[PDB]
Amino acid sequence: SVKSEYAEAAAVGQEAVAVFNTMKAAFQNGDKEAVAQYLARLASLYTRHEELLNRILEKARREGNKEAVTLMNEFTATFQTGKSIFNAMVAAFKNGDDDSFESYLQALEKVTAKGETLADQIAKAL
Numbered sequence: 001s002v003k004s005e006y007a008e009a010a011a012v013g014q015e016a017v018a019v020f021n022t023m024k025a026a027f028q029n030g031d032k033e034a035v036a037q038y039l040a041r042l043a044s045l046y047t048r049h050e051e052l053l054n055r056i057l058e059k060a061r062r063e064g065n066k067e068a069v070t071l072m073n074e075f076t077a078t079f080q081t082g083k084s085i086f087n088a089m090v091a092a093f094k095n096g097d098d099d100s101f102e103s104y105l106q107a108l109e110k111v112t113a114k115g116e117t118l119a120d121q122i123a124k125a126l
């Protein structure tokens with residue numbers, strides 16, 4: 001069902017939260033080799049999450065589930081905010097700009113925390 005597809009999507013999102021917090025600890029410790037690998041792992045996780053979310057939105061549209069479509073349109077828009085911040089973080093790491101990396105890291109945390117009430121609303125709407 002679309003609801004179980006969203007639970008699978010939610011788990012992938014939680015996998016990225018876990019890897020992100022490990023990556024933050026590695027960044028603070030200066031373990032740049034670990035950070036590089038975690039950033040690659042996060043990129044793959046966000047790509048998978050994005051695709052699952054798009055399939056869920058398209059299915060809600062085909063089902064005529066207007067409220068779930070509204071919420072998923074809002075949620076995917078916020079997802080792209082987080083994705084843009086993530087890509088800027090990756091670039092900051094490439095460039096050796098730790099000041100920007102720290103900034104983007106905190107921003108991605110706040111964007112993600114804000115979007116959690118909506119994430120829960122979607123589970124209930126589908």
Ligand SMILES: Cc1ccccc1S(N)(=O)=O
Pocket residue numbers: 046078079080081082083084086108111112
């Ligand atoms: C953190 C991140 C990274 C890439 C895409 C989306 C997100 S978010 N802010 O969890 O929607």
